Each structure stands twice: as structure tokens, then as C-alpha cells.
Amino acid sequence: AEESSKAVKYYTLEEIQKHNNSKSTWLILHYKVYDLTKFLEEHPGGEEVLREQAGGDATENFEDVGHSTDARELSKTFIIGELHPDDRSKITKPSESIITTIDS
Ligand code: HEM
Numbered sequence: 001a002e003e004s005s006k007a008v009k010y011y012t013l014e015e016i017q018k019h020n021n022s023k024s025t026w027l028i029l030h031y032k033v034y035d036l037t038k039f040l041e042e043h044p045g046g047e048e049v050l051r052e053q054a055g056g057d058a059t060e061n062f063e064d065v066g067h068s069t070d071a072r073e074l075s076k077t078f079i080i081g082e083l084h085p086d087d088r089s090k091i092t093k094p095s096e097s098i099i100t101t102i103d104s
Helices: 015-020 069-074
Strands: 007-010 026-029 032-035 081-084
Touching: 015 026, 026 081
Parallel strands: 007 081
Antiparallel strands: 026 032, 032 081
16 A cells, blocks of 8 residues: 565574575575575575575584685575674674594
């Protein structure tokens, strides 16, 4: 009648957590929110690879897998929003420090 709205722009860890279905594959990369549902098809690992990560900040993982500057840039095509102040500094800014010392 007289209104409009779209583009998540800013979502909460929960909002993204709710979206973890092949239909609502939402995840957070680096600190933004991307629509995996739009990047489902694509990806070598498959659609799940994204779904299995959809439902929160996948960066924490996507960082280990060590994606390519292309994969990251490509995600910019799915970017629908970003993590709000509800869990920004909670995920925002990637980082990981683990000691690797195995043998098997
Ligand atoms: C929003 C984030 C993601 C995007 C846009 C993305 C994109 C891609 C792309 C383009 C590739 C092909 C090679 C490359 O990395 O450039 C790839 C491969 C892969 N990704 Fe992701 N990925 C994302 C998140 C993840 C997460 C969270 C995991 C782990 C849970 C994951 C696991 C893998 C694996 C195992 C491969 C296959 C390895 C290979 O191609 O040799 N990805 N991803």
C-alpha cells in the first residue's frame, strides 16, 4: 500500500543461525552476512559445504580452509548484510592461533 524494505544489511548471530537450511543458507564471513543459498550451487565441496557452515560465522572455519581472494570476492556477490553489534566483536575480524604438532 505504502511501504518497502529489503537488504538485511545488519543481522544477528541468531538471525543467521536460524538460516541454516538449503533454502535459508545464511552465514557470516569475516564479519559480514552472505547468502549461501545464492552460493549453494557453486562451490567444489558442494552445497552442504556452505549449509554445514550456514547458521553463524563460518569465517572461523572458512579461514582455516584458506579460501582464495576470488572466493572471498565472489562472496561479495552474496553479501546480503553484516553481523550487527549483537555479535560483531564476537566474530567480526578473523583470527586464529593454534599450535600444530602432530605425527600420524
Ligand atoms: C562464505 C564463505 C565461503 C565461500 C564464499 C566459499 C567459497 C569457496 C570457493 C570459491 C572454493 C574454491 C576454492 C577457493 O577456496 O577459492 C571453496 C572451496 C572449499 N571450501 Fe569454501 N567457501 C566458504 C566457506 C567455507 C567454509 C565455512 C568451509 C568449511 C566449513 C569451506 C570449505 C571448503 C572446502 C573443503 C573446499 C574445497 C577445497 C578445494 O577446493 O580444494 N568453505 N570455497
